Amino acid sequence: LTADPPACTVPAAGVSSTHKLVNGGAEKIVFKIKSSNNNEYRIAPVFGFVDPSGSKDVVITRTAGAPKEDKLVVHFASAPADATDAQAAFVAVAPAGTVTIPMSATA
Numbered sequence: 001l002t003a004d005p006p007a008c009t010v011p012a013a014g015v016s017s018t019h020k021l022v023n024g025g026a027e028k029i030v031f032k033i034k035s036s037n038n039n040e041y042r043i044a045p046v047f048g049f050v051d052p053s054g055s056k057d058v059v060i061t062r063t064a065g066a067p068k069e070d071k072l073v074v075h076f077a078s079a080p081a082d083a084t085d086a087q088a089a090f091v092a093v094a095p096a097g098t099v100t101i102p103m104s105a106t107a
Contacts, residue, residue: 001021001029001072002024002097002099003074007093008060008072010094011105011107012064013061016060017059019060020049022057023052026052029049029076029078029079030047030078030093031049031075032046032090033047033058035103038061039065040062040064041060041063041070043058043060043072047085047087048086062103067083067105067107068089068105068107070102071103076097077094077095080092
């Protein structure tokens with residue numbers, strides 16, 4: 001599971017950044033995203049799936065605030081049987097791993 005790009009850099013005054021989650025594994029993955037800063041950041045989507053050899057776009061929207069270093073943590077796990085919506089399914093699965101995307105809001 002990779003993220004292209006693996007790091008985020010946005011203007012502290014405001015902006016948007018798109019990262020493509022890539023699953024090079026042989027099974028579908030379910031993921032949940034948590035931000036270290038829910039004040040100046042909005043993440044879309046927070047829950048989702050990434051198919052084998054497939055990808056999922058995650059948009060990071062930044063609003064005005066003080067420059068600062070933050071982190072976007074992506075918790076993931078094997079997607080269960082026939083889950084159709086990640087959030088519902090994430091309710092019964094314990095994450096298997098996490099990848100962190102740093103977010104640098106600069107002046």
